Amino acid sequence: DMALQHAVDLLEKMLADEEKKLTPLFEPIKTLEEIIQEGDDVVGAHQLVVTQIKLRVQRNRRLADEIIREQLTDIRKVFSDKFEKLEQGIQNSYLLLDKLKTPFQDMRCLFEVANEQFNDTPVPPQYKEKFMVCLKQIVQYAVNSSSKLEKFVMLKIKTKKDDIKDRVTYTCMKYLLMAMQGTGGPKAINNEEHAKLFFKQLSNYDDLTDANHDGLELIKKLDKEQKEVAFHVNNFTHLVTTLGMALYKEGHQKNDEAMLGMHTPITMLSDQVRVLILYLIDEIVHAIHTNSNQSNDELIDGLKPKVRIVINEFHATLMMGIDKMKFYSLNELREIVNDKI
Amino acid sequence: DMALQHAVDLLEKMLADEEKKLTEFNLGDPLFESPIKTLEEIIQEGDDVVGAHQLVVTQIKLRVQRNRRLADEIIREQLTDIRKVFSDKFEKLEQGIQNSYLLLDKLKTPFQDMRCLFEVANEQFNDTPVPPQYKEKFMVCLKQIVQYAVNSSSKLEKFVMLKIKTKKDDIKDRVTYTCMKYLLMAMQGTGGPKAINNEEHAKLFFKQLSNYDDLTDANHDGLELIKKLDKEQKEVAFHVNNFTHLVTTLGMALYKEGHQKNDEAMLGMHTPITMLSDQVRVLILYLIDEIVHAIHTNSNQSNDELIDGLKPKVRIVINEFHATLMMGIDKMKFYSLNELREIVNDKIN
Fold first, then answer.
1. Are A170 and A90 in contact (CB under 8 A)?
2. Where are the domains of chain A?
3. Which among A188, A246, A274 has CB closest to B285?
4. How many CB atoms lie within 10 A of CB A83?
5. Where does the sequence pass through the membrane (chain A) (predicted)?
6. Under an 8 A CB cutoff, do A190 and B124 touch?
């Protein structure tokens, strides 16, 4: 199914986890100046402001909720899009990697390399036919002897497919977390604590006129807190979209990061293929002249061990997977085959 | 001085290593290098077949040597293209790191000498409602207990200043690395294989000159090889630009990766800093609350007795802030006043 599914799940879970963390039987907020005028008498003014305070803390709490809810949804949309986009890149890299393996599928690139190399190898026309016959069969052998290599390539391909799924899910989850800790806000609220503190010592005033002065001041800050809301949500709508842009960029290139990681094995092997051909043609041409005695079938059966040694050496070289490209010269291959027979 | 200097070093180093791989005798080489004619001109001069054979045989033997020389020279234009692209992209990334250094330093200034405790205290004092008879006692105990809390917090301040330097270093390492990763890519992409097609062909042609029954046949092959040596050579400028593209593509890909390992460290900073500056605020509110509770629970105790009473609690709170802060950058939470109260009563047993 979906490659990044683990991330889409965690996204839906963590949004679920936050959404429930969020929270009229009988018979109204008043502006500050509406509070003062109805407040003719100190006791009336006082009863008025104690409820207005207690009311505004309730509004301020529910409004805190209404911004988290809009944050939780903004996050779903931003993180889903980048999730969906990162998904296509992965799916696409899957195809690109597979497209990369086909030359070495049944090692058929050998026939093509052999083909192109034959035409440009000069051999005197009298001997050209023996040459063709021996080359076909020895290349054909090399094909059949080359599964150790082919499977190497397919696995280095499967590994890179997976290395992408893992690494992108990881960066997916990471930017999710980042976005998630930044949701909602702090636990201890200033005003709610000023309010709590007001009410804790409301009986220690002596002059109710003083309490009324404080309660009004607390009300003004409960109002300043509330219109300061539009500031707080867009400061976040921003933060989430940059985390979104940052999610994509890291993910979209952890992706291309495995594809650029594929270059040296493929190109190093495909050169090793070419050099093998150049070796065989050389050893075949050499054999036609250093020995007029042998039948061609004897030649072919004779190279078979030499072919196995190089292939087995190519496979050995790749398992080291030296981060630096190693290239073979015709003669390096020629001295490496002479020693291990 | 320069932040990415190690990368600028390695670039300066790797270009020289390749230039010297051209200066040094590449094994099977001429001890001495000691006049070239096109295919249509070579056959024309032939007149005599035996003369004609000596000419094309000498021409291939020469052209392969020209190709060796053209090979060394394409690397040289590539080496400069790499210096041009990468030294430039390096300095742009450097300009980028230096800007984030500034951003990160501006972030430390609130917690410098923990001056933010005084600022929050200022603003929280101004907004705490207190009955006027207690307003001076409150003020007095608040003034001193905040001043104590500042003095007791070098524990946080040095740490905070540390995590910030770490981010400065983290940025340098991650970008230095990204510079080096892309350096190698361009560095491996130079030149080509050890085994050259035409070069190996000439060798095979020459290895078989003694078996060419008819020299019109030897000449026909030798001429074909001449063609291949010329095809390789006419495609030379085409493949050097095939690199100039490849390298400028590597340049943009270098910039983008570096610039975002950078932007990423700055976003790794955004919330944690706000969470500490939050702990600062809560600590203030906690003290204010504790002072107010204390003012009403005991009328006998002096101001100094009250303040001295709070001193241990402030230490407990800061030390709890610091403990959490060492836990890790993303494990930072938000504190509530009551959480602080249970973190303090339990730890007096």
1. no
2. 5-23+28-339
3. A188
4. 23
5. none
6. yes
